[PDB]
Amino acid sequence: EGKLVIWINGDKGYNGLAEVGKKFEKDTGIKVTVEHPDKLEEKFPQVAATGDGPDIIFWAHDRFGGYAQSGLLAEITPAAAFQDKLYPFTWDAVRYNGKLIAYPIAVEALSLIYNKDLLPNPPKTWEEIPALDKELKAKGKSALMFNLQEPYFTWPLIAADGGYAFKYAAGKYDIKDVGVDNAGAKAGLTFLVDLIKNKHMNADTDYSIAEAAFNKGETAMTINGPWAWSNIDTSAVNYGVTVLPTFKGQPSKPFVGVLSAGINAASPNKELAKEFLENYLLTDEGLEAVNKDKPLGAVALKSYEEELAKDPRIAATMENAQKGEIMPNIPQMSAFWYAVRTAVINAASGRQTVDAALAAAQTNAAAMDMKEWEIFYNKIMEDFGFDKDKDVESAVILNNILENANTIPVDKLKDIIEGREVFIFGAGPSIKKHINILKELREINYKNPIIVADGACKAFLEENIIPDIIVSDLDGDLEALFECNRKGSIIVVHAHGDNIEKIKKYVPKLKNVVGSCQIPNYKELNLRNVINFGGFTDGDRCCFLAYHFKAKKLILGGDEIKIKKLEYAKTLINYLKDKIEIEFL
């Protein structure tokens, strides 16, 4: 690793980035290898978490906040002379918790691309597209085709009439205020699902299918970004780039991306990556070498944007950009994108209704997703030596057992845990002291939810306080638990590679059970009786649980492999201290 490895998406001008790398090698003899693996935004966090991966990563800024909170990105500290060369708003896109975590490259915004020969007057509104499609279908052509597998391309329509991802409240994105299932979101998605049902589009259209059909003159319109103009030029189709159509009188609001280059925190060539990006790529000569391969958009480098801003296609990119919103860079963006992706794919295929698709996305958009959990998960698994495959087998087993015996619906805990000051109790030393604080606090009518770890069951019975929820792996004294379970307590049973025995044993004899697993696949495994809210120990898992179900504020009242679990606990508890009030007792 005496050289530079660079990762950028396959739809970008990586050949042009290689040209810059060749010049870097020419002057410093440092070989530069540009790669474009599939799903690089998801592969990088995995390879980087261990110390592997490229030296420089390229992607829209929206993923970089999750990379930084995981500690995967070195902090960039360019001289003020260099920062002044880039627009300040592009720097803001890559600032996370006051630290710049990447170099901004170019502003990406989707635009409407139309065939002038097939359609010299592109439509101004979505509503008039169905009439245009049947009209074009009389000539063997379609009106519109674009990638329906990535929510990036359908979000402009979903957001036109009021849809939003996370409310921007008082200078901060409120991860609790998600707007993917409000009136506007449903309206936008419905119009898109109607387009499929009415045969104006196919739910199967993906990137390649849409690009092929448009560049072959089969469809009159597509929706894509500046990177796609290069292939359209080669296809000889006479195209134009214009403003996206309006929906219900309101403009389409595409999430605007800023292509950014992050430096791997484990890379041993940090200073080399710094000089390459600052002195080779982010120059008029360097950005253009990339731009002539595949257009970047509105570049962040001021000197080079003055020339591109004259291009009418770039003019439309910014007009569409000004009507949308720069994406957040917060770590929860990964969860939002998965939620919307699944909702669209499910509502498009008809396999699920628009109402239920968005309602499911609403829950899991703000819910912690297995993206910042992949980091903690495997870190804990090999640190203790747990068998990753056994966490699978136990999670699956737990699910099948709950399919036919004595379940409680998830939203009944949502009935308890919401807008309330939930009490979380571990088996700590001050349990009796803090339980005394709570009792005299509950004795005065401040009677709000109570979630307790397994080892605290008997510690609560003795004061005749029946916990509302109990998080347990069914390891120790189960008698105290069982008594609580029928006096009202809901039991959240957690799957453990070392607990598969007692799962099959004690579960069927319990009432009011909800499933838990640590495994991060499960959603892809399509397990519907278990859930991974996040967390390692019963204590911290209680916190993820209350958080997962929209709890206002947490209130807590609780051989090295015993000391090392208490560290992951505080590690994971501090993780949520920036997402929910966490007042200790």
Ligand SMILES: OC[C@H]1O[C@H](O[C@H]2[C@H](O)[C@@H](O)[C@@H](O)O[C@@H]2CO)[C@H](O)[C@@H](O)[C@@H]1O
């Ligand atoms: O579809 C969700 C996806 O949207 C964006 O991905 C864009 C990216 O910004 C573009 O530069 C280019 O790579 O096309 C992608 C669409 O497939 C977000 O940047 C990305 O995080 C998100 O998952």
